[PDB]
Design an enzyme around this catalytic site. Structure first.
Site, PDB file in Angstrom:
ATOM      1  N   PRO A  33      19.100  13.146 -28.131  1.00  0.00           N
ATOM      2  CA  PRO A  33      19.799  12.606 -29.320  1.00  0.00           C
ATOM      3  C   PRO A  33      19.869  11.086 -29.205  1.00  0.00           C
ATOM      4  O   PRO A  33      20.025  10.553 -28.112  1.00  0.00           O
ATOM      5  CB  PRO A  33      21.218  13.181 -29.317  1.00  0.00           C
ATOM      6  CG  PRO A  33      21.046  14.441 -28.489  1.00  0.00           C
ATOM      7  CD  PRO A  33      19.995  14.062 -27.408  1.00  0.00           C
ATOM      8  N   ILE A  89      16.352  16.544 -31.682  1.00  0.00           N
ATOM      9  CA  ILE A  89      15.339  17.584 -31.782  1.00  0.00           C
ATOM     10  C   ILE A  89      15.917  18.823 -32.500  1.00  0.00           C
ATOM     11  O   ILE A  89      15.452  19.207 -33.586  1.00  0.00           O
ATOM     12  CB  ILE A  89      14.675  17.866 -30.439  1.00  0.00           C
ATOM     13  CG1 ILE A  89      13.848  16.624 -30.047  1.00  0.00           C
ATOM     14  CG2 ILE A  89      13.760  19.071 -30.544  1.00  0.00           C
ATOM     15  CD1 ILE A  89      12.947  16.809 -28.867  1.00  0.00           C
ATOM     16  N   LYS A 100      24.544  18.738 -25.884  1.00  0.00           N
ATOM     17  CA  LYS A 100      23.340  18.385 -25.128  1.00  0.00           C
ATOM     18  C   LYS A 100      23.703  17.512 -23.938  1.00  0.00           C
ATOM     19  O   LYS A 100      24.648  16.726 -24.006  1.00  0.00           O
ATOM     20  CB  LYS A 100      22.316  17.667 -25.998  1.00  0.00           C
ATOM     21  CG  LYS A 100      21.464  18.584 -26.768  1.00  0.00           C
ATOM     22  CD  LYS A 100      20.140  17.917 -27.054  1.00  0.00           C
ATOM     23  CE  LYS A 100      19.360  18.701 -28.115  1.00  0.00           C
ATOM     24  NZ  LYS A 100      17.964  18.202 -28.303  1.00  0.00           N
ATOM     25  N   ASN A 143      22.369   8.965 -41.657  1.00  0.00           N
ATOM     26  CA  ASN A 143      21.127   9.691 -41.901  1.00  0.00           C
ATOM     27  C   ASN A 143      20.857  10.622 -40.722  1.00  0.00           C
ATOM     28  O   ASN A 143      20.967  10.209 -39.573  1.00  0.00           O
ATOM     29  CB  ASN A 143      19.952   8.713 -42.077  1.00  0.00           C
ATOM     30  CG  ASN A 143      19.924   8.015 -43.457  1.00  0.00           C
ATOM     31  OD1 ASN A 143      18.977   7.276 -43.748  1.00  0.00           O
ATOM     32  ND2 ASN A 143      20.929   8.253 -44.305  1.00  0.00           N
TER      33      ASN A 143
END
Lengths: 114, 114, 114
Positions: free
Chosen positions: C1, C64, C32, C97
């Site tokens: 990330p 991901i 994560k 975003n």
């Protein structure tokens, strides 16, 4: 829409009222009220275009809709005209990436545009 | 075309000539004339990689042609060697996002590549 | 990330521990390994939102997996929460975003994930 401009032009050459003008111009262009328009300008960048450090810019326009072949072609016309007139950058030393964002993928006010 | 590097490394340590070198290495790597290549380097960025602040890099590569699983693997070896050598950044502290761009979504010289 | 924050708030207002804070909380939110999450904060930016220059932020979250309608929604609460609480930015002057990254298109340590 979100418009970002990264340029090696020095901050001092960015005219008073540039963010105001981009907002108004982009609103008229995309048909979206100006309230949704975010503008980010980054001056004094390192960057190079053909292994040359002449004035250049790398931009991007993100939008939930209003992105398309014809549309993006008009925006290049609008946007490159402004950088030429306002910042004195050759249009062929300007890249603009266009992004058509999916509403569920834009967080805004503690949530997203579901 | 279009390579960006954001890094916490100091501006004083990005070699002069780094931009040209990237320009050349990418031209060879992608088989695109160097003239189409734009490079942007952003030093002195706040950033952190794994909780830690040692030198790290966040890059992104946008190309209309030449993106794809196997190719990207090569781009990573090339890009990691460059940053490791020229900026003393460790390969495990580098992320590079790859973007295959559609020519209609890329504007240049008052128009788009479509 | 990877999480980037662009804001017009003065650097002097970014509280120490902010990056660790974001690293810690994003790891938890996304579940994560924190050793895998980069954070990038960019203050003192020339930004306008809805034609206004009052405090605002343009952010990005690249990952991901762990991204979709519902999660984006909770990422937003958490993210807009933090930004308001530490940088005193109003959540309605913040865009985030979300980019569901495709492994094979992310480079790290001389290869790509997946």
């Amino acid at each position: 829409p979100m418009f970002i401009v990264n340029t090696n032009v020095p901050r001092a050459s960015v005219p008073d009222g540039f963010l105001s003008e981009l907002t108004q111009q982009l609103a008229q262009a995309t048909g979206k009220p100006p309230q949704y328009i975010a503008v980010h300008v980054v001056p004094d960048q390192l960057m190079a275009f053909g292994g040359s450090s002449e004035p250049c810019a790398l931009c991007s326009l993100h939008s939930i809709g209003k992105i398309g072949g014809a549309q993006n072609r008009s925006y290049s016309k609008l946007l490159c005209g402004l950088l030429a007139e306002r910042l004195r950058i050759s249009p062929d030393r300007v890249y603009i990436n266009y992004y058509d964002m999916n509403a569920a993928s834009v967080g805004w006010n503690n949530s997203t545009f579901a």
